[PDB]
């Protein structure tokens, strides 16, 4: 729960704003409705539905300030733990061709400090590679270098 400053509060009900469009100081399965399809997104009523069910903790159907301000937040932490582990792959993966070799993963272990015999390195890939390519995607490096 939020201990926020009001700077922090107040984007918060700019935001809030953009979605409830009567100004009543809750959002509709409609103004949600409406929102998605601004923004190119024709969604229909089960989605909705269910993407109010989500932020409807204590189920009037609706949506007030306080709900939202809930989700708004903890889907800010993850939209950065998100990034934070992508970064990560940027620099794993040095050639962005979008996938991390086995020789990237030996540069980089040694661009930083440790000295992996192939072996090693590829005792490393294996273990994560769920697709076997041999390679190591977003995803599985994710699945992977998250959790572990
Ligand atoms: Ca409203
Ligand atoms: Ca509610
Ligand atoms: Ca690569
Ligand atoms: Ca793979």
């Given at each position: 729960a939020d201990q926020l400053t009001e700077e922090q509060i107040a984007e918060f009900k700019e935001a809030f704003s953009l979605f409830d469009k009567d100004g009543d100081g809750t959002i509709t399965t409609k103004e949600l409705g409406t929102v998605m399809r601004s923004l190119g997104q024709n969604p229909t009523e089960a989605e909705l539905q269910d993407m109010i069910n989500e932020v409807?903790?204590?189920?009037?159907?609706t949506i007030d300030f306080p709900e939202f301000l809930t989700m708004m937040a903890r889907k800010m932490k993850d939209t950065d733990s998100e990034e934070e582990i992508r970064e990560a792959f940027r620099v794993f993966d040095?050639?962005?061709?979008?996938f991390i070799s086995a020789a990237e993963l030996r540069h980089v272990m040694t661009n930083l400090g440790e000295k992996l015999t192939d072996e090693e390195v590829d005792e490393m890939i294996r273990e994560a590679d769920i697709d076997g390519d041999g390679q190591v995607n977003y995803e599985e490096f994710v699945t992977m270098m998250t959790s572990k």
């Open positions: 409807d903790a204590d189920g009037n159907g040095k050639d962005g061709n979008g």
